[PDB]
Amino acid sequence: VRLTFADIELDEETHEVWKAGQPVSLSPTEFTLLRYFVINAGTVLSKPKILDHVWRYDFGGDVNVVESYVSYLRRKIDTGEKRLLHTLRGVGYVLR
């Protein structure tokens, strides 16, 4: 029941993430974003998918919020040499 992808190890019940034994504390928004990324490993998720699921539907603001959060997650857990959370321009994001 432990969510995994190679380096990243996310546990829902205890609510923190490991990088091969390296825990880091994340904000709730970014935590939901990372969780609902990891459960969709290798699959493209578009911006409406991201906003409707991680954020509530009634989010009436502009989209770059997810851009900033993906930047946060990249500088936090992608900070290893290899790049996992890749971006497909005009489509979305995939962790792979």
Add this chain to the structure above:
DNA sequence: AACACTCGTCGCCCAGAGTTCACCTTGGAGCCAGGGACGGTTCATTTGGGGTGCCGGAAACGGACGCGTACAGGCCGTATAATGGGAGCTGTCACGGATGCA
């Protein structure tokens, strides 16, 4: 084939099984009288405790905001000479009528 003995069966006669019929007692079953203490109730405390609204403020956190970079798509130009397509395969018939020629 001739001859002289011992055993059920019944009645009868006297004593009690045990049953009825029929006499005295005495532990009552309950009925009431009297006296707690008692547990249910109620009401005085009693301050031990729950409680809280707001903040100085410390720190996360959510996002705006400005400014860099990134391929995607578009425009543009290449100076020896290079000057009129391959290919299509066509076994129908009926037949009304226009139609280009009669």
